[PDB]
Amino acid sequence: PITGLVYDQRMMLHHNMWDSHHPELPQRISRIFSRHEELRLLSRCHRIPARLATEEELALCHSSKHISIIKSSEHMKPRDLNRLGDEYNSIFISNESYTCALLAAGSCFNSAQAILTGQVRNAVAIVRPPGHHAEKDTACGFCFFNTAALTARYAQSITRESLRVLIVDWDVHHGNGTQHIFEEDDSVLYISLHRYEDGAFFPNSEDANYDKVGLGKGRGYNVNIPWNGGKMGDPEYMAAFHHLVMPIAREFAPELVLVSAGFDAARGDPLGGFQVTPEGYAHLTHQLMSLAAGRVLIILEGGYNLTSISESMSMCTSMLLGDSPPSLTPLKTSATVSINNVLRAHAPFWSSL
Ligand SMILES: O=C(NO)c1ccc(Cn2ccc3ccc(C(=O)NO)cc32)cc1
Ligand SMILES: [K+]
Numbered sequence: 001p002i003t004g005l006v007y008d009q010r011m012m013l014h015h016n017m018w019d020s021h022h023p024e025l026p027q028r029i030s031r032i033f034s035r036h037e038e039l040r041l042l043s044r045c046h047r048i049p050a051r052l053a054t055e056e057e058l059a060l061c062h063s064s065k066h067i068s069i070i071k072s073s074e075h076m077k078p079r080d081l082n083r084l085g086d087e088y089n090s091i092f093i094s095n096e097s098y099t100c101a102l103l104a105a106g107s108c109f110n111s112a113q114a115i116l117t118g119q120v121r122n123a124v125a126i127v128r129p130p131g132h133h134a135e136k137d138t139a140c141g142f143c144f145f146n147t148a149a150l151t152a153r154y155a156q157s158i159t160r161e162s163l164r165v166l167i168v169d170w171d172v173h174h175g176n177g178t179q180h181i182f183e184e185d186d187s188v189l190y191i192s193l194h195r196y197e198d199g200a201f202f203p204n205s206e207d208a209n210y211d212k213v214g215l216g217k218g219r220g221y222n223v224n225i226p227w228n229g230g231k232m233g234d235p236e237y238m239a240a241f242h243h244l245v246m247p248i249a250r251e252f253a254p255e256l257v258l259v260s261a262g263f264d265a266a267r268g269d270p271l272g273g274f275q276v277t278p279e280g281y282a283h284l285t286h287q288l289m290s291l292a293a294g295r296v297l298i299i300l301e302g303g304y305n306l307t308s309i310s311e312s313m314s315m316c317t318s319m320l321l322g323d324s325p326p327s328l329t330p331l332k333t334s335a336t337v338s339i340n341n342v343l344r345a346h347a348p349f350w351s352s353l
């Protein structure tokens, strides 16, 4: 029962040349890593080396044109970096962004390999920039390549094509890119919880609604749990896991679990407006560990309150390491509406609901 950890300070180099206080801060990963050290979690883990993803690996999910353009930013002048970033929705680019994105994805590849070859049982990836908004052909929402999506396809490439991967995305935002890459796929189950507000919360698309259940062979294998009209917290996320995430996950029977673990639904995050506690995140993690013979990889996505993300992700690693889940209640009626809309939408596909 070994827990793996990947972290590389070089991922700090990606930065916003025109706003040094932009919330997607280099110090997000350094503060998380320092907290793991202070709580003596880092020393209990097997340290997994970071590496660069290759261009061929990026092609598992991304087009050659998208790869080529982000790769070209390594040599761009500031004016061109500013212009290129402005072509995307909510993106800033520095000369180091491309290599930092490659390191984020390659770090998760080595961790997935460590889990699947049996070097470790589960692992945590402290990485940036994030991934789950990136699409096959575009960058978006602070994301250049879809790290989680690439890790599922990489895991299949070193095992078998039909390896069953569950991606649970508990970042407060919908992972539009992850949904789209796998929308027609029945080997990768995508389950996202996210603030939605009738499509008015970023990324501002009705793609995130409960009635997007997948396409073709992928019908049933895309589960959107959208939140409306309420500051949601531990009881809503616990209830969503009880009624939706875990029954569906168990019937899918994943062989590997990836968590797109944004912590911008955490109490104290200005971008999320929610109040999931560190104890709540620990309970979510502990529930996922009952799947896939414990093969769970926790991947940092969003999360912008430096203290909140450090405490929340540390609680997740503590659960992975086997520590007892900490001690933690009527739901907002809006959350009941949301959960029951997902249940009605997915009853045709999941007999255990
Ligand atoms: O993925 C993320 N975090 O993990 C993420 C990605 C992109 C953005 C874009 N963005 C940046 C400032 C800002 C303000 C308001 C809205 C808004 O309200 N739109 O409706 C959006 C905004 C935010 C968060
Ligand atoms: K999400």
Ligand SMILES: [K+]
Binding pocket: 182, 183, 184, 185, 186, 188, 189, 190, 214, 218, 221, 222
């Ligand atoms: K899918």
Ligand SMILES: [Zn+2]
Binding pocket: 171, 172, 173, 262, 264, 301, 302, 303
């Ligand atoms: Zn987010």
